[PDB]
């Protein structure tokens, strides 16, 4: 897919509509980006694709606090 995993934020089919309010969609999507994160515990780079609203929220609970909760919905191989 194309999801945040962190906040889960995913593509919806929303529309900005028309000016005569005809049926049309183009989708609103998240801001997924690969940002280079790294565990210290297993000491390697574990680069995740996550949104930039997602990023604000990572900051707000503490970086390694959302990452403290991660690895119970882990993605790494």
């Amino acid at each position: 897919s194309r999801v945040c995993q962190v906040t889960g934020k995913r593509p919806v089919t929303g529309n900005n509509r028309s000016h005569a309010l005809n049926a049309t969609k183009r989708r609103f999507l998240p801001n997924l980006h690969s940002h280079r994160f790294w565990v210290e515990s297993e000491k390697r780079f574990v680069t995740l694709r996550v949104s930039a609203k997602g990023m604000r929220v990572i900051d707000k609970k503490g970086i390694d606090t959302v990452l403290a909760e991660l690895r119970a919905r882990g993605e790494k191989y």
Partner: protein, 149 residues
């Protein structure tokens, strides 16, 4: 957010200083570089009582690094160190001349530079010469070194 500093780099910082910083210093400078820890209201007491030990015993042999940040964003050096100038004597081996690489570069295409006049780079006391290529027929020799703040 806010931070307790761990460094003194640019015109901010002072080797430990609780200041407010933004999200250009977080996720774009100090972090991600180990050059800060958040200050929240928990941290603010932990780190601060902690920093009057750490940011004392350690601090005074690491002054090289703190300094070079300014010198390389302005540009006047192509040699860098995290210790060098903190005994009267220079330390490291970083520098284009003898790593067989190009570093401290972000506009210049080069990826090689050859060694010319053996003096050592951050291995002889005082300044040393670094010689840096842009062709095999055009050159730019210079006199560079890393010292403490």
């Amino acid at each position: 957010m806010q931070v307790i500093l761990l460094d003194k780099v640019a015109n901010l910082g002072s080797l430990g200083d609780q200041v407010n910083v933004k999200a250009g210093y977080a996720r774009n400078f100090l972090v991600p570089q180990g050059k800060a820890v958040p200050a929240t209201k928990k941290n603010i007491e932990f780190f601060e009582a902690r920093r009057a030990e750490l940011e004392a015993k350690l601090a005074e042999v690491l002054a090289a690094a703190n300094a070079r940040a300014e010198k390389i964003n302005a540009l006047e050096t192509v040699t860098i160190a995290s210790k060098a100038g903190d005994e009267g004597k220079l330390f490291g081996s970083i520098g284009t001349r003898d790593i067989a690489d190009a570093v401290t570069a972000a506009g210049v295409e080069v990826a090689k530079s050859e060694v010319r006049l053996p003096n050592g780079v951050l291995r002889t006391t005082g300044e040393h010469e670094v010689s840096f290529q842009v062709h095999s027929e055009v050159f730019a020799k210079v006199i560079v070194n890393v010292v403490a703040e």
